[PDB]
């Protein structure tokens, strides 16, 4: 039964998701502010109880003088937060013919040299050990289907646009896609209440969501900015849309996940898995998303600012 997070991961949709606040006194860089208010949103919401994994990222982008390129460079920083939190998971889970000559050509295959070890126990074990690395990192890039995000922030400090994303793990989640993928409560226009254009700038991402029919569905943010309102609310699109395409991309299959551990082994640093992935974003394929429909729409004004956001959210069903 997935009875436990449907007012889990909706409740997380239905939270206000305002830019965090900080006054001219508090001293805290972008980087303090955002891991204060995610450790507090995890620790208030008990959400280690709830799910096997917790993680939390931050990314940073800078922006321009007038801040005209505020909704990009935002766009980047979830993007970058959003990897390295998929990456340290990754890591995390990655911590927790005679015999001879056979065993020298499986050193190479694995692209070991079998002269850098002396004994037959030497090469075995470096054999062994490159299995488990391998077995380790699929397992890994595997359960990338089951991380999800449920909360992000954004800060704006210091000429820069910083972004905190919380990620949760679900073997649910994840067998939920896989059955999605061949095998097999409330309305999204109404966890958005009256939930205004502040309330929503705070949200990047995709999240999965349950309507009233019992049924899953995936809700993709994005923002624009410039009546001009045509335009916001088009580009808002764009972004909303990325989102569910590096979604997708990271339901990787088998082999996927095998080359790409292969091709990083040439605990696991984080900071190597991130560029990895950061790649395989770049170059994988496009496929155009069917049935895309707009549940919101919103326009913030950017305070003393004559500068204006648009913001779309777009519900994908799979």
Request: net charge negative; charged share 25%.
């Amino acid at each position: 039964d997935m009875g436990a997070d449907v007012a889990n991961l909706n409740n997380a949709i239905s939270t206000d998701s305002k830019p965090v606040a900080t006054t001219s006194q508090d001293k805290r860089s972008a980087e303090e502010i955002l891991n204060d208010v995610m450790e507090n949103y995890i620790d208030q919401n008990n959400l280690r109880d709830r799910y096997d994994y917790v993680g939390s990222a931050i990314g940073t982008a800078s922006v321009n003088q007038t801040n005209s390129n505020y909704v990009d460079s935002a766009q980047l920083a979830f993007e970058k937060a959003l990897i390295k939190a998929q990456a340290e998971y990754i890591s995390f889970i990655s911590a927790n013919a005679l015999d001879e000559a056979k065993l020298d050509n499986q050193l190479k295959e694995q692209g070991l040299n079998p002269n850098d070890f002396a004994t037959p126990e030497e090469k075995k074990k470096a054999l062994l050990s490159q299995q488990m690395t391998i077995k380790s990192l699929t397992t890994g890039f595997g359960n990338l289907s089951g991380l999800l995000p449920i909360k992000t922030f954004v800060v704006e400090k210091d000429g820069n646009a910083a972004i905190g994303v919380v990620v949760i793990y679900s073997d649910k989640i994840k067998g939920m896609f896989e059955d999605i993928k061949h095998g097999n409560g409330q309305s999204p226009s109404d966890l958005y209440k009256d939930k205004s254009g502040e309330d929503m700038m705070g949200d990047y991402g995709i999240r999965v969501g349950f309507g009233e029919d019992n049924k899953p569905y995936i809700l993709a943010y994005g923002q624009g900015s410039y009546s001009a309102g045509d335009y916001g609310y088009k580009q808002a699109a764009i972004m909303a849309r990325a989102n569910l395409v590096t979604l997708i991309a990271g339901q990787m299959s088998t082999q996927e996940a095998l080359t790409m551990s292969e091709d990083i082994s040439s605990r696991i640093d984080a900071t190597d898995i991130e560029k990895t992935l950061s790649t395989y974003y770049k170059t994988k394929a496009n496929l155009d998303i069917v049935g895309l429909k707009t549940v919101k729409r919103w326009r913030y004004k950017l305070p003393g600012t004559e500068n204006i956001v648009y913001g779309v959210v777009l519900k994908w069903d799979p």
